[PDB]
Amino acid sequence: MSQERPTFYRQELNKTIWEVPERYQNLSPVGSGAYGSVCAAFDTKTGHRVAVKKLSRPFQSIIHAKRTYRELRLLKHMKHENVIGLLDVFTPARSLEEFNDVYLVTHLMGADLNNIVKCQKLTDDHVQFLIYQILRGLKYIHSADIIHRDLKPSNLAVNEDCELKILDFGLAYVATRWYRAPEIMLNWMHYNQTVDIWSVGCIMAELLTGRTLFPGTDHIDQLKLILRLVGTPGAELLKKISSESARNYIQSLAQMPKMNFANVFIGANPLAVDLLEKMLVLDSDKRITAAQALAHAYFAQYHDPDDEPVADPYDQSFESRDLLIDEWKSLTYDEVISFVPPPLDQEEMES
Ligand SMILES: Nc1c(C(=O)NCc2ccc(C(=O)N[C@@H](CCC3CCCCC3)C(=O)NCCc3ccc(Cl)cc3)cc2)cnn1-c1ccccc1
CATH class of the missing domain: 3.30.200.20 (Phosphorylase Kinase; domain 1)
Incomplete structure (x- = not known):
């Protein structure tokens, strides 16, 4: 025994x-x-x-x-x-x-999400299912106050049954930066879990168009590509950015309007366009959460609140120890x- x-x-x-x-x-x-x-x-x-x-x-x-x-x-x-x-x-x-x-x-x-795309053209049903599963996993990790921070297609594994897992392969081409929310990239403020939702938006866009949404070469190029789609920060968001130099830099830039996403993602399911609008909000206090996103009508054929669980509590008191x-x-x-x-x-x- x-x-x-x-x-x-x-x-x-x-x-x-x-x-x-x-x-x-x-x-x-x-x-x-x-x-x-x-x-x-x-x-x-x-x-x-x-x-x-x-x-x-x-x-x-x-x-x-x-x-x-x-x-x-x-x-x-x-x-x-x-x-x-x-x-x-x-x-x-x-x-x-x-x-x-x-x-x-x-x-x-399974192969990663880049491999999936290279090897086949995705149906709208499979885009719905793949983004659904990412959000399902995020609801879980976020509920334990765990933030991924590194979401990108190479950190998503997909099997032949189209089942997806989130992972992080860590250190050492697709730049994690391309999928990163501006506030975390640029250290504008203490960030929330919706930094991961920004990344989901960037991934979804790429699944719909076949192209990287924001392929920036460095932090300044990345920001400029972002603001060209979502527009320069409004007054409400600018007040929440701590650094005066960062604020002054932002204000030096040419004013840009928010694009109408229905024009940009022409051809896409209107429901997908609406959800992308809610994920790529610049002010992270207004950006949709994973659990909210699961309820969006885009996922109507997959969503089931009683099959979208939260995580047991996670004790991260070690993170503060030296x-x-x-x-x-x-x-x-x-x-x-x-x-x-x-x-x-x-x-x-x-x-
Ligand atoms: N190569 C592999 C593997 C493999 O490598 N497995 C081991 C493994 C262990 C840990 C993680 C892993 O994900 N850690 C994470 C865990 C926590 C994470 C999980 C996702 C939700 C959020 C939390 C992890 O901690 N990151 C390290 C992250 C990191 C490290 C350093 C720095 Cl500076 C930054 C980030 C991932 C794989 C399995 N299949 N295949 C395969 C795939 C296709 C073809 C052939 C073979």
Whole structure:
């Protein structure tokens, strides 16, 4: 009746040592270096393929150690159909004193939203469903006061059933900047969760037109492209920007009117145009939230409030702590050894 603890095995792949539980077999590197050190593997406990990631220099510095801890805490929290989740986390270490390596196991994700677009032309139904699922995932993460901040097509995984998950592949072409709200890009003020809604608007526009909405080359070019669509800030919004230099810069610019989006996105479903208007509002105090957006008539064939859950509370009191490297490392170790795995999925077989 004691819980089994795994036996590990060791191998080399691409000049990298991999030491993993024997349940993970046929490790094979994936993404030719793009995603970091990641292998596909067959999980013998589930009969499915998974991704195994060996973290890079997880405790290099206080910053890296806190980053490691943060990512593990977040991954462990996420329990939602449209957000990446954690299948397993392990280390070959048998104590904190020999703890150096952290491995994360996730589902093997679908191609990203760029790949989807490159390979097929999307129907309005699939645009509705893909944007719906992003918003569904955002309702969940936002309810726990978690903001993504990095939404872009490469951080959205889509499978052959058109099911979507939100993730963040992190550090090291599509610039995250192109999808970023001005107030967060430019540090105008303390921002809200609707920075992510701006990104959804930018993604939706691109799915409708086939073109990047605001492909700015730097912060000033990005701002100018944005204001050309949505118009220069009004008096109400200008008062909420803290920096006098920022305000003075903004006022130096040529006045621009808000464009009529029905002219810009001509051909698109009028409901999609109306929702884009509500997502790309410049003043983030007036921008639609994820939960509100789910109720928009554009999503009438997918929306179901009783199937759009919120998240359990997430304790982010660690974010305010200044700790030493070994303290962040020990906290990470605690999270590894406290991990409780999810149950297997339903295994109904249609053929
Ligand atoms: N390559 C892969 C994987 C893979 O790599 N899995 C491991 C993995 C682990 C964590 C995350 C991950 O998302 N972390 C997040 C977690 C929290 C996040 C989740 C989304 C909602 C908001 C919270 C994370 O913390 N970010 C780090 C972000 C970051 C890091 C550094 C900096 Cl400076 C800024 C941001 C994502 C993948 C799986 N399939 N495939 C595949 C896909 C196509 C073909 C072939 C193979």
